[PDB]
Amino acid sequence: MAGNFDSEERSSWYWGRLSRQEAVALLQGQRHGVFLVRDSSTSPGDYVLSVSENSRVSHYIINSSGPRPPVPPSPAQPPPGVSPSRLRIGDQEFDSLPALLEFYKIHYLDTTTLIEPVSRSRQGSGVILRQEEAEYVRALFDFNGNDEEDLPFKKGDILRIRDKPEEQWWNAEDSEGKRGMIPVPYVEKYRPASASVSALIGGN
């Protein structure tokens, strides 16, 4: 998780509209009590709630007004300024659409109740991609090589820690281009730059 960003949360229930078949296609793929929302394929300016009921997934047309701007951008677009309830679905009334999914969770739409957002996949993770620096170390030992995983480098070779599994061996690219283990407990932080014409190069 990341926190509070979208009062309606797009990656949760409202992705970016499509055809009931599409929503359905994914909906059924999730938990039986899963339901997502789509765009009013019938109405020009309205929302639609989709719900995997029984074997398929039915839709519920929502009616939105829009009293205030939706997104920060947009040069100028004067809003209505009258629609009180603004958003509503079925034969009842609610403040907004996002809020609707939070109340009907136990009110029962037309036969089925709302439980959680479909969420087919994707999530704010980013797999914490560091990639901090890279080329800034000069090996201090020569070795022909025995294992494909071990980085065979020659004394004075400026490698780049391609990763750092543990403090007892890291990953780095050698003058040849291959990677492997490197001296994490003792390496030469040697600023490489002056030739770039390959002096010798002889690994495999």
Curated annotation (Swiss-Prot):
It is found in: Cytoplasm; Cell membrane. Residues 61-85 are annotated as: Disordered. GO terms for molecular function: cytoskeletal protein binding; ephrin receptor binding; insulin-like growth factor receptor binding; kinase binding; phosphotyrosine residue binding; protein phosphorylated amino acid binding; protein tyrosine kinase binding; receptor tyrosine kinase binding. Residues 132-192 form the SH3 domain. This is Adapter molecule crk. Component of a complex comprised of SH2D3C, BCAR1/CAS, and CRK. Within the complex, interacts with SH2D3C (via C-terminus), and BCAR1/CAS. Found in a complex with ABL1, ABL2, CRK and UNC119; leading to the inhibition of CRK phosphorylation by ABL kinases. Interacts with ABL1, C3G, DOCK3, DOCK5, MAP4K1, MAPK8 and SOS via its first SH3 domain. Interacts (via SH2 domain) with BCAR1, CBL, CBLB, PXN, IRS4 and GAB1 upon stimulus-induced tyrosine phosphorylation. Interacts (via SH2 domain) with several tyrosine-phosphorylated growth factor receptors such as EGFR and INSR. It comes from the Eukaryota. The C-terminal SH3 domain function as a negative modulator for transformation and the N-terminal SH3 domain appears to function as a positive regulator for transformation. The SH2 domain mediates interaction with tyrosine phosphorylated proteins. Mediates interaction with SHB. This leads finally to the down-regulation of the Crk signaling pathway. Isoform Crk-II: Phosphorylated by KIT. The keyword Cell membrane applies. Residues 67-82 have a biased composition (Pro residues). Belongs to the CRK family. Signal peptide: none annotated. The modification N-acetylalanine is found at A2.
